[PDB]
Design a protein around this ligand. Structure first.
Ligand code: A1B7W
Ligand code: GDP
Ligand code: ZN
Ligand code: ZN
Ligand code: ZN
Length: 167
């Protein structure tokens, strides 16, 4: 049978939500992708021998909290919380995204992975130890990714699937 996993990618504008998603879906680094466009993608994949369908929401658009937006985000079974390792503000914004995730899921235990993207970049401002400690305090995995070199892309999404399996 084919289990679907509904995944939602969140994180500050410009951290790489779209580039990560396209790199998963299309196996290409797209260095300019409309920052406003929010879309969803299906990909049949095999994770630990399980054939599954990833249904991935690449969050975009504007910050608003209508009932329609809440209902779409609430269908998410697991969330990628993405920051950029060269952007300390995007790391600090993880608090707000985890806050919104918990709100719509009405749960203090939501499958989540903390994703530190742009690990190909030399000019890093967020230490790995700092991101590891945050993820540890939340009980979630941390993974560094580069949508540009594709390092960790599959594993960030697969790790999220394994967290969804846990709950
Ligand atoms: C190109 C870009 F600009 C760009 O890509 N976006 C910037 C604008 N978006 C958002 N921004 C901020 O807050 C930005 C800052 C941080 C502190 C407060 N705000 C001042 N918060 C949200 C959004 C999207 C909608 N939303 C959510 C609404 C309702 C329910 C949710 C449940 C779970 C998770 C979410 Cl995420 C929910 C929260 C979209 C995207 C970012 C994403 N994700
Ligand atoms: N160097 C590098 N740049 C990246 C990476 N991921 C995204 N970018 C760049 O960061 C910018 C914003 O990426 P985007 O996917 O649109 O971020 P989004 O707003 O979160 O969807 C783009 O110009 C990308 O070229 C990465 O892993 N490494
Ligand atoms: Zn985007
Ligand atoms: Zn679906
Ligand atoms: Zn908030």
């Amino acid at each position: 049978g084919m289990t679907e996993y509904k995944l939602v990618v969140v994180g500050a504008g410009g951290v790489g939500k779209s580039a990560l998603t396209i790199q998963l879906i299309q196996n290409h680094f797209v260095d300019e992708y409309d920052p406003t466009i929010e879309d969803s993608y299906r990909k049949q994949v095999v994770i630990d021998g399980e054939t599954c369908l990833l249904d991935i929401l690449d969050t975009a658009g504007q910050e608003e909290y209508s009932a329609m937006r809440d209902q779409y985000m609430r269908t998410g079974e697991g969330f990628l919380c993405v920051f950029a390792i060269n952007n300390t503000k995007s790391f600090e914004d993880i608090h707000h995204y985890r806050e919104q995730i918990k709100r719509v899921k009405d749960s203090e235990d939501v499958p989540m992975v903390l994703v530190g993207n742009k690990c190909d970049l030399p000019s890093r401002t967020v230490d790995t130890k700092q991101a590891q400690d945050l993820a540890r305090s939340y009980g979630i995995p941390f993974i560094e990714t580069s949508a540009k070199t594709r390092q960790g892309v599959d594993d960030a999404f697969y790790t999220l699937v394994r967290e969804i399996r846990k709950h």
